[model samples]
Target: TCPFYKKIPGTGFTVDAFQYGVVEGCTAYFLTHFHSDHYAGLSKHFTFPVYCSEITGNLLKNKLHVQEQYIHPLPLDTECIVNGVKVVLLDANHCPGAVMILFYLPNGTVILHTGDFRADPSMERSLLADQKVHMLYLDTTYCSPEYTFPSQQEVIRFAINTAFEAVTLNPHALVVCGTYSIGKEKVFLAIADVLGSKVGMSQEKYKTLQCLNIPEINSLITTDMCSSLVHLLPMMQINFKGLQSHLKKCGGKYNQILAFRPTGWTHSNKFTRIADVIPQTKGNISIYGIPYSEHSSYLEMKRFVQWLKPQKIIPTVNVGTWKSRSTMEKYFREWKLEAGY
Candidate 1:
């Protein structure tokens, strides 16, 4: 959840707040990723210098049509002094070109902006290991304790196995996997590898994937629907109605349609095992909701705060309402205790 306006409280720098038009007193702009929500309002109209991961820069240029002259593609894990501020970009483990940014101010303050990320253990030993972070702008998309879900790898493995079984049982079935323009490439790619099948997608998505520098992407994707049983589509097209329409397009080439919509919200807190969750089925079209998340789970968020030990925490998401803000504060207080603060 991005804020209505995304300006770092005390700094002249803004991160992921392009929609507000021109921010007053803003000297530099930083983009964490190329997701629509994060990069909203950024278009060919942009004139300010925008810094992001090199991969993200490519998307801004190719996908958003932003001029290449305004993009500053920063290399990951290296420090660059911009406008008298020390800046560093670290891999966010969220999506292609997603990064956790570190800004060291002139007044000896360290600010970490986790634009949107899945917490990984190795991040503790990354560039921020030795520094004391004063302010942490965190991605609190799953701030509640009830938001816990299985790891991405586990969910992908389950989906792959489930897909393999489904295809084997019904050899002529067509498989479709959901994805964003940038994220969730791993899930469908793994499924295709295990099933030994090629993935079909629109020419537009294929062009975006090329910017990611994914290995063998050119060979893995096809625009010819007749060549592949598996297809990678947007989240909106993974439902029963959409699947039915696609089945119609195939002209009875595929007898059954199996689709996977991978997202964190699909997993319920009431269930600990993702396999127990049932799919929504109607005749030959079945939609499986897998808990494949790019955001940190409640447990992962807690571990990150405890390890990072930032002086202050700011909830980037769920801050619009006082009720939600108070609940997040409660969790932060409990996390503070666990962090020995």
Candidate 2:
């Protein structure tokens, strides 16, 4: 077995394989998910065969438009060998194509990499069985217990209720929302549920939701069927002029127009700039800020780490920042030792 080394920052060595140097003779690197932080550097440096779930493979090929030569698609709960090391992909209910990776080395050291996984008990029980986990790389994006977020369904209901109330107050106005790419889909679904019919959805989104076996919560309208009802399109980041033009084209004598996005409307200062960019509507344009998050909360992260007893738990992605690293290290040290790691 190759000895593992920790390369701290400013050591002139890239911690992961994707930095500036070429790690020759390295066996393989497992990608737990297709998040930008985990796979951003992979395209340029890592040329070896990459292992990920089928959904992640399609996302890389279609969404990110990466080459297919280097990807080796793996289904959930199946084991595959790379350079003599066994790896298994498990369902991670973070996003559409996310997965948790379990790597079993020849030396019998099992490493479970929970990539941005939420504490969904059903998902956890399905993925993590009675297997012993040695080194666990946990997601510590939220490690404090004070942070909290409502369930996805609850957030959707809030948005839907707000939209319905707004429409009732002013039937001629449009309501727009700001959200990220993955998050936008939820808002769209909520609108569909509120409308009690299918709203216009892009072919790409439709295919993605279908592949994940997403049960239709309500009838949805697609771009192809936009002529029959109101139009709800995703807004690009900072593209106010384009949005205005599109709204103008959609608006008419009797049409009660509404345009909204799931993201890109606020800065770090918490000020909403979407209204500033796009001109206010004649009837009433409402921009709502419903609390919804893609990442797990601090308490959720703690619960997940507690359940997966491992020797040493390392966090990747956003929580791996320098200022936050020590705090997490201290927290995990106590948790892991108490949990018999």
lDDT of 1 by residue, 146-263 (tens): 8878878788888888889999999889889887668888888888888888888888977888899787777787788788888887788888888888889888888998888887
Show model 2 residue runs off by greater than 4 Å.
1-22, 41-47, 64-69, 168-179, 201-221, 224-246, 253-283, 319-322, 334-341
What overall lDDT goes with each candidate model?
A: 0.86, 0.57
Model 1 reaches what TM-score against the true structure?
Answer: 0.95
Deviation (Å) of 168 in candidate 1: 1.6
Per-candidate total of colliding backbone pairs: 0, 19
Quote model 2's TM-score: 0.73
TM-score of every model versus the real structure: 0.95, 0.73
